[PDB]
Amino acid sequence: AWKGEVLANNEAGQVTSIIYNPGDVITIVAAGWASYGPTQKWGPQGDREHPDQGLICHDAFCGALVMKIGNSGTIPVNTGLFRWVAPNNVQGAITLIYNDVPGTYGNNSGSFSVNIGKDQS
Amino acid sequence: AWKGEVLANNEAGQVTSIIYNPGDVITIVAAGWASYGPTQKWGPQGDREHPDQGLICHDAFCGALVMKIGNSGTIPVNTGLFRWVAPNNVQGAITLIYNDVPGTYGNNSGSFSVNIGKDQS
Amino acid sequence: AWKGEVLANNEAGQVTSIIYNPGDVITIVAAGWASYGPTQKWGPQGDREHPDQGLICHDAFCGALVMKIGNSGTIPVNTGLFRWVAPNNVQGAITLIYNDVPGTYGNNSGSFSVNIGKDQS
Amino acid sequence: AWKGEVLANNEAGQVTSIIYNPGDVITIVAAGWASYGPTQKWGPQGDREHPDQGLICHDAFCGALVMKIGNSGTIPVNTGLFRWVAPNNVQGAITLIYNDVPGTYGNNSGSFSVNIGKDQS
Ligand SMILES: O=C1C=C/C(=C(/c2ccc(O[C@@H]3O[C@H](CO)[C@H](O)[C@H](O)[C@H]3O)c(Cl)c2)c2ccccc2S(=O)(=O)O)C=C1Cl
Ligand SMILES: O=C1C=C/C(=C(/c2ccc(O[C@@H]3O[C@H](CO)[C@H](O)[C@H](O)[C@H]3O)c(Cl)c2)c2ccccc2S(=O)(=O)O)C=C1Cl
Ligand SMILES: O=C1C=C/C(=C(/c2ccc(O[C@@H]3O[C@H](CO)[C@H](O)[C@H](O)[C@H]3O)c(Cl)c2)c2ccccc2S(=O)(=O)O)C=C1Cl
Ligand SMILES: O=C1C=C/C(=C(/c2ccc(O[C@@H]3O[C@H](CO)[C@H](O)[C@H](O)[C@H]3O)c(Cl)c2)c2ccccc2S(=O)(=O)O)C=C1Cl
Ligand SMILES: [Ca+2]
Ligand SMILES: [Ca+2]
Ligand SMILES: [Ca+2]
């Protein structure tokens, strides 16, 4: 099990102690408030009224919580995943990233508290 | 396990099949968008900028996801709970409710998709 | 969780901290060597070559591990159960018992090391 | 979650769908009756009164259930394991074998019904 924070101003993303292996079933629960620039802040689901202007994950709103599993493409996490299995041939360490446009994280603020654990399978 | 919708305009709240027993460990994951009256919609965490004007749950923002186990006070759920254990002497059927001011659920819209399951204890 | 030893001479049976509730899913693992009289010892499955001369559990060999959920009838356990759901209307505390004949427990020796834990559901 | 039979006369061992990884936690429940030659059968714990004439697992009775993880030395399984964590540097596929002497499996009979599953870590 892993528990830490993901800073919005972290373009590199926060690496976790979890390593997803084929067949694993995980569960994620994220909370907190972050911002992709503006003064106000949004939840893990992001800003639904802001358009996709070249985010790292086009399957989630700007300011939403996404993740990389090893060397895979970005994967939507949002509020979290419940007893979830990854697509075929996806394996590696889980890495939580704040969904924002590359090279803009500079003005970001806030963070997300995230819990990750492997369920029984 | 349980999975269903929780309407923001349901003052009575949505009842689930889950019944929390002493010692049980549960996990919740909530997603979706709802509104406590206005036009825009907030996540399960609610509206952090909206002041508490008499919510059924004072430990959560307006438009946040709360719950009631049996017939206790409202307990914050927000984005969800991760391998969580209720306080002492708390037990009964789990009821999900939209955190709003009593008698105002009229102009509410949207809903939350919620998953509930018990983890090994 | 619960971990303890069930004595073969204990006619009343060992009472665990596990309280089975409707819907629950449990897993049991039993090991060790015990006897229903002789100098020989058998595993949690009991002695397959000994007739039923009035055992508290007729669906399990003599010298085998059984249990009673609350105030129900004896239920076979043996080596243990894997993610197991109790029959309809079965609920209560869990008591582990060495399968023998009422009043004969006197000359019994040995014990069973048993682990019981509520599983995910 | 694997479930199958471990034939007694199968020397090379029964290969399961499980691929244990570092940090993993598993639970095993073995049941049934087998034999290493005689006409009488023993449980997953084996025959406690038969000496070691060159077993493949010197830490478990002859006729007991053992397993090999990747390229490790045989490990006693017996009645099973409860929320068990493999030793340091132990990883790979799982192979359940009937503990015996190399080349004698010829006259073995019976098998063990076994369940394997990863618990929430
Ligand atoms: O020509 C323009 C038109 C609208 C506009 C507003 C705007 C633009 C961006 C923005 O946040 C930026 O978003 C990107 C990536 O998503 C990056 O994170 C930047 O660092 C952020 O500053 C905000 Cl908060 C506002 C605007 C205003 C009102 C309604 C809609 C918009 S829109 O851009 O979404 O269309 C800015 C320019 Cl230059
Ligand atoms: O005298 C007033 C001053 C401001 C004001 C705005 C307001 C108030 C409430 C509100 O949502 C209501 O919230 C309650 C429960 O929390 C209930 O759900 C009602 O049905 C909702 O209408 C909204 Cl959307 C707006 C106002 C405007 C701008 C900034 C802040 C506020 S305030 O919320 O702080 O009051 C309304 C009145 Cl009458
Ligand atoms: O007519 C009979 C013929 C043989 C016989 C032997 C026997 C009986 C009991 C026994 O263990 C006792 O079992 C009872 C209840 O199950 C109680 O637990 C006592 O405390 C125990 O001592 C044993 Cl180990 C043996 C016998 C002898 C040789 C082979 C098989 C048997 S048999 O019992 O399987 O028939 C008893 C009777 Cl009545
Ligand atoms: O000189 C002897 C004296 C007793 C004896 C009995 C015996 C030996 C082996 C056996 O099964 C064999 O076990 C080996 C592996 O350990 C292998 O599986 C063979 O294929 C099997 O045939 C049986 Cl069923 C019986 C015996 C009897 C009672 C108690 C102890 C023993 S002993 O094994 O210690 O000797 C065999 C010989 Cl050669
Ligand atoms: Ca930015
Ligand atoms: Ca309202
Ligand atoms: Ca007896």
Ligand SMILES: [Ca+2]
């Ligand atoms: Ca043999």
